Amino acid sequence: KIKLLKAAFLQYCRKDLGHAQMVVDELFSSHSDLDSDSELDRAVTQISVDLMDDYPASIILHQLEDKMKAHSFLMDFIHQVGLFGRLGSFPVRLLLCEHAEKLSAAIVLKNHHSRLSDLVNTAILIALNKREYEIPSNLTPADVFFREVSQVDTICECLLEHEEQVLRDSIEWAEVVINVNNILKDMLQAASHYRQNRRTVIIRQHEIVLKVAYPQADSNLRNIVTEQLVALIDCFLDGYVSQLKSVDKSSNRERYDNLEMEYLQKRSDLLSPLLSLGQYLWAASLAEKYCDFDILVQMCEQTDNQSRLQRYMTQFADQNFSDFLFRWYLEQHGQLANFLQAHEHLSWLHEINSQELEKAHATLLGLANMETRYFAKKKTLLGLSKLAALASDFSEDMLQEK
């Protein structure tokens, strides 16, 4: 209730100077509590989340640095006493502290690069949610916006999309769409770089990836090369986040894991189709970031004349040839693609080219046995099988049997 939150928050302020008074409050609370992992464990997590969210919401840089410095000291005092668990994530609202730290790290990076468009976007996002106070404080929202970083990131795409309609896109107008993408990438990288030292968010990235692809068809080569890096860096982070979210739940409930796998595979195939018309250097980076979706790599290594790429991507993997053959059978460079696809039915030529007389003879015999609607074709297949068996250097008994 309200008595536990007012008591747990008072002991954290006095723990920075002493330790004997804060250790007596946890031992008595652990004995007075019900000590149950059903409903009693959710009461401590709800108070901890409220105490952690209040520290981040209280000199714009100094105020943001003080909250980030005070939030890190609260995690050590709770871990030294314990507070040995109390996990209450579930849906929407241990992961709460990480999310709060990521939000505090992403909110501090946006304040250092304050510009004319960023301030206008922040004001438009603050005015669209609620009303601001008329008594000075022209910021207009810092403590109330740092705790909810998902609202500022989702509303940033609406401000740039409104100005792009009246921009007549033209040279100087293309920099405004790249400045927001660079800021978004820098804010997303800060939340991912801080974790290693321990529906609304994906829509803003999916819309940005689609809007950045339309502006590359009427811009300079340098601008198109610079705008494609932010989209690739965002896609590599989104794929990593999806893999981390999917690898955190398994064993039981296989239906959810099977449903999420299809959604994760469909999102990677759509982004690889839009990037195939531009530079081919992003495919290797995407494959190194996310070790999945080999159909895109197999198509990139087949559409061009890079014969060594298919072998390099197969010798440094795990069971890549079996997947490449299955992808080729289900679909210079043209000759290599035809030889890779020739595995079933018409495989005698491939077996003869790959030095396999016995395999070619077996394939010809199988084709002649399966065929039953062309006497000329059945005779030609039998003749080819006989020629392959005569040319093969096998045993005398096998040759006589053939």
């Binding site: 529906r199 829509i203 999917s246 690898v247 739940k249 409930r253 449903l259 959604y263």
Partner: protein
């Protein structure tokens, strides 16, 4: 609600491409045809045939095995649920309503309904008034039967008209019969509320999900195999088993903090697989008869993704 005619394409084999979508007005009907387009993306397109009229909100949908298709005419017989706490079961042809549905006998709000086909028209409903209605329409008028048992999701067993299943709101799964009354009664997780308890496609198992992502399987053909796993998120719309794989089930969800809903595919032995993941809330979902396409009904449209 959105549910395809899985029984018509199995126990009969006629109207397999029919898909009912009950909304606030009435219930629309769709057709799933296999056109060209692309075989790697989706080789099954959805075509809106006709839409019937009623005037009341339909909370559920359950087709029977008496549906046929002759030339352009199509006789259907599905059991829905009116908004006035009732379980209607009319039989219209194509788009015109040839018969009405006099549903009266539910004391509280209904929760689930089903329809079977043995000697005429057997329908089993379940309300919140601790009563399990069993309407049977034979040749001599009809026969009403009520039993003091709480239900939430009643479903008949496959290839067994004399057996049925009923899942209570407190976590009790009773398997009653039409002659020996109740026979067995199971119980899953009693600490949280239950969702549903439907059988598998092999007509020999009974999978029961809960509201707190607590699923339990009890296959009788696997020498009494009692598996129990847990999903990723909570399943508000229970779960839907596959028509070919008995160890596979799909359960939708809805994260309100990220404004994105995902449908994880639960499987015994496999890992967490989320093939479906839209940015909107899903009202219902149903698998096709080919075990490859998923007809997920949203709040304003209906998608058809193929895995």
């Amino acid at each position: 609600y959105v549910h395809v005619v899985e029984f018509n394409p199995f126990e009969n084999g006629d109207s397999g491409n029919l898909i009912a979508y009950g909304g606030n007005n009435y219930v629309v009907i769709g057709t799933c045809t296999f056109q060209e387009e692309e075989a790697d993306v989706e080789g099954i397109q959805y075509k809106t045939l006709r839409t019937f009229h009623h005037g009341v909100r339909v909370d559920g949908i359950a087709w029977s095995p008496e549906t046929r298709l002759d030339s352009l005419p199509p006789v259907i017989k599905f059991c829905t649920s009116a908004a006035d706490m009732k379980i209607r079961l009319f039989t219209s042809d194509l788009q015109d309503k040839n018969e009405y549905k006099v549903l009266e006998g539910h004391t509280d709000f209904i929760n689930g309904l089903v329809f079977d086909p043995k000697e005429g028209q057997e329908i089993a409903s379940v309300s919140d008034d601790h009563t399990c209605r069993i309407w049977n329409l034979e040749g001599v008028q009809t026969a009403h039967f009520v039993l003091h048992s709480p239900g939430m999701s009643v479903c008949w067993h496959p290839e067994e008209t004399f057996k049925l299943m009923v899942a209570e709101k407190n976590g009790t799964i009773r398997f009653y019969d039409l002659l020996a009354q109740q026979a067995i009664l199971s119980l899953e997780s009693e600490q949280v509320p239950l969702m549903s308890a439907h059988w598998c496609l092999k007509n020999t198992f009974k999978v029961g999900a809960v509201a707190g992502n607590d699923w339990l399987i009890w296959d009788i053909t696997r020498s009494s195999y009692p598996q129990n796993k847990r999903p990723v998120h909570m399943d508000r719309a229970c779960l839907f088993r596959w028509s070919t794989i008995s160890e596979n089930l799909f359960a939708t969800t809805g994260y309100p903090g990220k404004m994105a809903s995902q449908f994880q595919i639960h499987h015994l032995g496999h890992p967490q697989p989320i093939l479906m993941g839209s940015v909107a809330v899903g009202s219902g979902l149903s698998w096709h008869r080919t075990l490859p396409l998923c007809v997920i009904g949203g709040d304003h449209k209906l998608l058809f993704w193929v895995t």
